[PDB]
Amino acid sequence: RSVQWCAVSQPEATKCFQWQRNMRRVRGPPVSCIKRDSPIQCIQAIAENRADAVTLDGGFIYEAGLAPYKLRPVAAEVYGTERQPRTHYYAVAVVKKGGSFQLNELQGLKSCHTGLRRTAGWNVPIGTLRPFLDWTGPPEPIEAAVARFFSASCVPGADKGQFPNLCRLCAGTGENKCAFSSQEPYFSYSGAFKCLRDGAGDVAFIKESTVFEDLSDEAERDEYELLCPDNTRKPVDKFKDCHLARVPSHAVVARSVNGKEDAIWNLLRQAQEKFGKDKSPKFQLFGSPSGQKDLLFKDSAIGFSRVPPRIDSGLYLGSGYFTA
Ligand SMILES: [Fe+3]
Numbered sequence: 221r222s223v224q225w226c227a228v229s230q231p232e233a234t235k236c237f238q239w240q241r242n243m244r245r246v247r248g249p250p251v252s253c254i255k256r257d258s259p260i261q262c263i264q265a266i267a268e269n270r271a272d273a274v275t276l277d278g279g280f281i282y283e284a285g286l287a288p289y290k291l292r293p294v295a296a297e298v299y300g301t302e303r304q305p306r307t308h309y310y311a312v313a314v315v316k317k318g319g320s321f322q323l324n325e326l327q328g329l330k331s332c333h334t335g336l337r338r339t340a341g342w343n344v345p346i347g348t349l350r351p352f353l354d355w356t357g358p359p360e361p362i363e364a365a366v367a368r369f370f371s372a373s374c375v376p377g378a379d380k381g382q383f384p385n386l387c388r389l390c391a392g393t394g395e396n397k398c399a400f401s402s403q404e405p406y407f408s409y410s411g412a413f414k415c416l417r418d419g420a421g422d423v424a425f426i427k428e429s430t431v432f433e434d435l436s437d438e439a440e441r442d443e444y445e446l447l448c449p450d451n452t453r454k455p456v457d458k459f460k461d462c463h464l465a466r467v468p469s470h471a472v473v474a475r476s477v478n479g480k481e482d483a484i485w486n487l488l489r490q491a492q493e494k495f496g497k498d499k500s501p502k503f504q505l506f507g508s509p510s511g512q513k514d515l516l517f518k519d520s521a522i523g524f525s526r527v528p529p530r531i532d533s534g535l536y537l538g539s540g541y542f543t544a
Pocket of ligand 1: 340470
């Protein structure tokens, strides 16, 4: 009963079958592929024993750990470089150089977010910005307070009908507009950075590596800066002293009871050695096809680090903090 990986979209399922084929070719541990249409559908499938593993951003690790699911993080993604690896990242606010607006002066501007309920793209910035919002609190959806704070935004996964403003800057065509998938050009970290790069938004809520990885000409980095919580703007390489939060990396979650943790780890450990960073030219576990974003795992990540037993989502997440 090989590990059953859960894809949250068709392109992800396609990559999973490619991963599977390659594992077979190299005689490594097998990986089955189950296809679903959203992170919560994968979380449910796992809780239901219909799947075993799925990589999630912290905002979703939180949701996955709640009843009736109770999934726990078993393996964390590793970012940084081989010489300087790390299992954490920085939520940053990137802007075009030239402007004078600061973090406390975003009312009425345009924003680009990785996706609804994601760490760097939603939870941290919206949390940080709360003092500047006019949220009356529940039962009002915070999306309403946000849609009336920013004049227009691209928040992949937002309710187009209820909060049209949150999807207006999204580039997807037809029903793909504002999709929480690669169907939306402005989805995830790279998509949100593109939303800013293209000039659709004034600020992009992403991570520190995006700008360095997405510009094929290093000279273009000069066109960008970061909005610091102390209300100053600094170069994109100063993220350590200029970020909205430092948070633990995305992680593969599994069932807390009979979750097949040793199997999942053996699969990931081997998948990394054979198809990880600069390993096989035939398949890249951390690479996605043209126009697709972070299929299965974070594009350009470098490996995994096993999470010690009995650490639940709450405990895993407790390492993240926000500079409000
Ligand atoms: Fe994230």
